[PDB]
Each structure stands twice: as structure tokens, then as C-alpha cells.
Structure 1
Amino acid sequence: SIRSLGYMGFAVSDVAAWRSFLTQKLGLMEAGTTDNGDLFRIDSRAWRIAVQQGEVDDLAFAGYEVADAAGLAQMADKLKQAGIAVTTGDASLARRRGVTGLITFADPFGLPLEIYYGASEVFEKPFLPGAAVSGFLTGEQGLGHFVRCVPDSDKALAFYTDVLGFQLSDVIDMKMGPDVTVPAYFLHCNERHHTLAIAAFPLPKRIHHFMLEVASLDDVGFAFDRVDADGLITSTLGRHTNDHMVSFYASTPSGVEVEYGWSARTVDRSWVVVRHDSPSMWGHKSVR
């Protein structure tokens, strides 16, 4: 069973811009360059984000973490039973990712996905942020979340819930103009309100944004000013209606957006599915 989103990889046209953006604006730690690409850390794990040179300027792959080898076997089995083409990653790929075992496949719309177990910890190389950030929230909640843009939400929903096992948290009916309302589905696989959201938005990218969660309000406020100085803010500070995250959005060098937030609420056993008509309680004024 998938426990969390463990890592993500981006294929970008300007690797240098990304390196500077992630470290100096967002405060991630530069962890070196390997055949896996430029590596960035936010906690004890050897890397959480990989940046590789590429033409797409988008998310290249995402890795979901299981607890152990048995969990990996279960997922591989579940995918095969669903008719999905799964490939047991070879030692070379496993070594490149720094994991113990992994399987590779793609979602219904071509996003390369990986499920793995036994990632590398580097407690001996204590995390030191590239900018003043008190800390990132990961742990059992994993890396954070991202919104997957799809041409067909129902097909995407079936794959992610029925095959991958994500559970629905809530739905937000996004009013995009008078004759257009698009439902965005928020899914969880652990306590984090959502690790994945699905929506049929008309965008040139695989994802609308990815999100990183920090430990204090000041982390967000300081990062906002750093990003604003270069005119990269896309949405002002605000708080979401569903996860209650206080955040701002900014544009990465690839056009893909990043959400930087704090204080999200978690999902518990007493959770019930609900619907909303607005994605924000306050703030989040679009300055795009």
C-alpha cells in the first residue's frame, strides 16, 4: 500500500535557473549532481527533488513510497491484475534513484510513475537549507502534493483510487467562467489532506503545481518576499477551504507553479467527503 509521495523529477530547459530558484528562493539544500541529475534535499533523505536537462519543462516522473518489499509486491500485483504494464526497475535504475527496489509504469495519460521501497537516508550529512527556512514538513506525510491535469477526470479517478488506492478527501467545483465549472478531486494516501489532486484544466503541463510545506508562518513570509523581488508571485497569500493551508503560489522557471505553504490540517478516521464551491477562504488573489 502506498504510504506517501517520496520524490519527484523535473526535465527542464534551464537547469541553472532551477538550481538558483530552489536553493535561493525556496531554501532547498543542494545535494550534488549524479546520473540522477542535480539533487535537492528538504530533510534526512538523500534527495527529494531531481532536476535533469530536458525539453518538456515539466514533471518527468514521481515516486510513491511503500513500506517494504512486501508492499512493493502487493502493488506490482495490483497493477498487473488491472492490466497495467509494469516493469521491475533494474539494479541500475534502483542505484540511480538510491532505493532498494522499484517498479515503473505510467498513469493513463503518460506520466511516468515509480513505486519503490528502501530509499537512502543521510543523517550523517545534516540538512542545511539554501535560504532561511526553519524546516519542511515531511515525515509520514511525505514530500507534499501536486495537481495532475488530465483530459478525463473520471478515467484518472478510477486509476488512482481503484488501482493505486488513494482515497477521496473532498471536491471543489472550480468556476472557470460562466459556461465552465470543473471539479477538482483531492486524494490522500496518509494524514496529509491530499498527496494528489486531479482536475481537467486546459493547461500545457502535466501538473498545475507541486507544493512544499514549511514549519512556520515566517518561513512563508520570508520566501514570499524573496520570490516577489523577482516578480514571480502568481497568487497572493491566502488560505484554502479544504486543507486550510496558508500559502502563496509562484512560477518556476518551467512555467509550472509551486505552492509554498504552512499549517494545513490533516485527515483522520472520522473524516467525511464534502464539497466546496471556492478553493480559498481568503487571499489567493491571482496576480497572473
Structure 2
Amino acid sequence: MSIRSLGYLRIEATDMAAWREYGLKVLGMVEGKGAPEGALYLRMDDFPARLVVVPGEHDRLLEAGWECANAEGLQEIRNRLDLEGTPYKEATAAELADRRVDEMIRFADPSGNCLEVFHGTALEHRRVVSPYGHRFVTGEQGMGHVVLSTRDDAEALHFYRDVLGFRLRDSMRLPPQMVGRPADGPPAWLRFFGCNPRHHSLAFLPMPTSSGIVHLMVEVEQADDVGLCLDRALRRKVPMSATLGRHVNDLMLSFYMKTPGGFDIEFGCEGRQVDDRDWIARESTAVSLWGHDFTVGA
């Protein structure tokens, strides 16, 4: 059907205490109920967790989990993966119980970022209330989007578009020097990927990161929610990556800020919806309409 949205992200961390206070006091997410080691479960809506943090010696991406509509929809991904020759494994009894899904397959892309593709998640039904009064925009758009590293842009395009069936939604070139090529280069390509109306749920920057993550975006309903988060971040001396601005691409009004795992979170609103029957995949030539001053890091 087929992948349909970003379901969860599992990350590994060296500072579980900082994650807990950043997730609860800056992001205004809600902590989920146990939660093994722990192991922090961060909640946005009726999913048992969207952001799962497990303790370890590295600050990195473990898995990205991707929701399908049903059993048939997972089978479609299986059939595609076999057609290409991508090795994949069924979740073990213990993995299904842990993620709380009916079926799941595990595999990596050629970079290899690890993927979990699943169907039949459990939901928790008590209202999830942020103490700051914002609601996240999830539903049919899913969790948010993730921008990850790739070792090779053309190879990512192949895997995500041709093998897995994402749609190419947007493309932006990088000057050859920024990816270590001679100024004489081939530019390289940052490509954005859609699986549902959310402009993108996924993108591949062909430059390295230590975590494997460039940014995670989560969306709230209103500008005020973004603005109030900015103030909570500033008050807690969270480092800023980009100033408030509006994207050209997805029309998201957002700021970026460093998380305790070293990568950025984009916290935004007003994200653009895409119909695949109308959409023309083209190249954008700027990141923002205004704002998003990425020089603010240093």
C-alpha cells in the first residue's frame, strides 16, 4: 500500500538524564510507561512511543521504523526487497513484543541505515497532554520527518524510490567542495522523499554525521507552539542551529536546535501537503524563504 509514514525512531544515548529533561521540558513530549533498561519512551500522540532513547556508549541512530497499512502492505515491501536482493529478517518474538507490532522486518539500506518496517502497532488511549498545551501533527502524516546521511546520493535514490517506492518530492544541489570533491566537481544532491501527503518523511544528505542523523523534525499545530518552544529552549540554554524561518520546500515554519545526542531537531508548524497526482518533482535553489540562519551554530 505501502510504506505509509514514519512510525518511530530508536536512538542510542550517553546522557539519559539530559534526554529526559530535554524531551519533557523543551519538546513538551510525554513519557511513556515502561520502558525496559531504561530506556526513555517519548510520546506525541496515541503511539506507545515515537522517540525511544536507549543507554549506550554512543549518541547515534539505531533504527527508523516505518508503518504500513496492514499485512498486505508489509508483504508488498517484502516482495520489493526480494526483487532487489536486499537481505532482511523477520522480527523475533521478543522484538515484536518490545515494539508492540504484529509483524516487522529488519534490514539496512546500502549506507546502511537500519530500517524496521511494520504493521499492526498497539495504541495507548488516554489523552496525551503536553503541559505546554501544544498538540503534535501526526495522524496520516506520521511522526515527522528524518534527514539522514548517505554515503552515495544516486544509490539512495535507487533504494528509496525504485526499491522501496517512496516518491521523489524535491532535490537540492550541494557544491562539490562541501562533499570533498574538487571545485571542478559534479555537484552532489540532497533529495527529499514522500510516502504520504507530508511533503517529506525522509531526506538523504550525502555528508557524514556522528549520530547518522542530520535532523529530526516534529510538527505542532500553530506558530505559537513553535514560538513558545523557542522560549523554553533559550531559557534552558539549548544551543541553536538555525533561527526561526520558512522553508521553500515544505513551507514549514520552524527553528533548529541541538539535542543531547548532538543532532538537531527541527520543531515546526504549517507544513505543506502534497497530492501525488498533481506533484511535480523539481529542484529547489534555496533552503528558506526567510530566516533559518544556519550560521548561528558558531
| TM-score scaled by length of structure 1 | 0.95
Query: How far apart, CA to CA, are the structure 2 residues paired with 1:150 and 1:57?
Result: 18
After the TM superposition, which segments of 4 or more aligned residues of structure 1 sit over 6 Å from their partners? Answer: none
Query: How far apart, CA to CA, are the structure 1 residues paired with 2:290 and 2:259?
Result: 24
One-letter amino acid of the structure 2 residue matched with residue 90 of structure 1? T
Structure 2 SS opposite 1:120? coil
Contact 2:250 2:271 in 1 (8 A): yes
Structure 2 SS opposite 1:33? coil
Which deviates more from structure 2 when the two are superposed, residues 52-61 or residues 246-255? 52-61
% identical equivalent positions: 39
Contact 1:39 1:48 in 2 (8 A): yes
Match of 1:7 in 2: 8
Query: How far apart, CA to CA, are the structure 2 residues paired with 1:205 and 1:150?
Result: 12
Match of 1:25 in 2: 26
Among candidates 190, 193, 196, match of residue 184 of structure 1: 190
One-letter amino acid of the structure 1 residue matched with residue 190 of structure 2? A
Contact 2:153 2:188 in 1 (8 A): no
Contact 2:47 2:124 in 1 (8 A): yes
Deviations 1:77-128 (A, max 9, x none): 21122111110112210000011111111111122110000111111x2102
Contact 1:4 1:141 in 2 (8 A): yes
Query: How far apart, CA to CA, are the structure 1 residues paired with 2:134 and 2:233?
Result: 17
Aligned pairs for 1:112-261 within 5 A: 112-123=114-125, 125-129=126-130, 131-175=131-175, 179=183, 181-229=187-235, 230-261=237-268
Q: Give the gaps of 5 or more residues in structure 1.
A: none
The 1:110/1:133 distance shift into structure 2, 3 A limit, reads farther
Contact 1:32 1:40 in 2 (8 A): no
Match of 2:283 in 1: 275
Which deviates more from structure 2 when the two are superposed, residues 173-182 or residues 216-225? 173-182
Structure 2 SS opposite 1:239? strand
Match of 2:86 in 1: 84
Match of 1:59 in 2: 61
Q: Give the gaps of 5 or more residues in structure 2.
A: none
Deviation (angstroms), 1:187: 0.8
Deviation (angstroms), 1:144: 0.6
Query: How far apart, CA to CA, are the structure 1 residues paired with 2:189 and 2:4?
Result: 25
Measured on the aligned residues, the alpha-carbon RMSD in Å equals 1.6
One-letter amino acid of the structure 1 residue matched with residue 124 of structure 2? V
Deviations 1:49-70 (A, max 9, x none): 1010122202210100111111
Structure 2 SS opposite 1:219? helix
Deviation (angstroms), 1:214: 0.4
Deviation (angstroms), 1:35: 2.9
Query: How far apart, CA to CA, are the structure 2 residues paired with 1:283 and 1:67?
Result: 37
